[PDB]
Design a protein around this nucleic acid. Structure first.
Length: 74
DNA sequence: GCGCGTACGTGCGTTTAAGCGGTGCTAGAGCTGTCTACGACCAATTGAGCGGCCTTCGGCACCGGGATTCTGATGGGCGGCCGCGTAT
């Protein structure tokens, strides 16, 4: 669960991962949240976002989903 | 010191609401930008304010004069002294 990530970061962070999937990924609307920086701490290889959030009301949402998986792109 | 009483500490179970991190929204602080009113400053004149000096009537508490009330020597008259004293 989302709260179990913020509550337990040392147990899940000490394990290596390679694939990450999330349903209803609208929680990453702002790039200044604890979950946004928390998911970026896990050393993974590939990610996958399965959601249908409106990426047109704010550019920080689409850009947040761009740099969330590809750090460097605009 | 001692003794009576009971209330408050310690426990468990039940229960209730803080704390967490999640998002959204807009209000109200903070910044910013132009104008100008109100306060500082310098001037000259004026009387409120301070030192210097002594004021007057009213109120607390001691006072003042005059009629009136109570105590003391005075005094004739009715009675009692029984004891020295003159007359036959």
């Amino acid at each position: 669960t989302y709260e179990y990530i913020l509550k337990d970061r040392a147990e899940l962070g000490s394990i290596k991962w390679q694939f990450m999937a999330v349903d209803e990924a609208h929680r990453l609307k702002n790039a200044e949240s604890s979950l946004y920086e928390s998911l970026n701490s896990f050393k993974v290889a590939n990610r996958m976002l399965i959601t249908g959030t409106p990426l047109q009301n704010n550019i920080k949402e689409l850009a947040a989903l761009v740099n969330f998986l590809m750090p460097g792109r605009f």
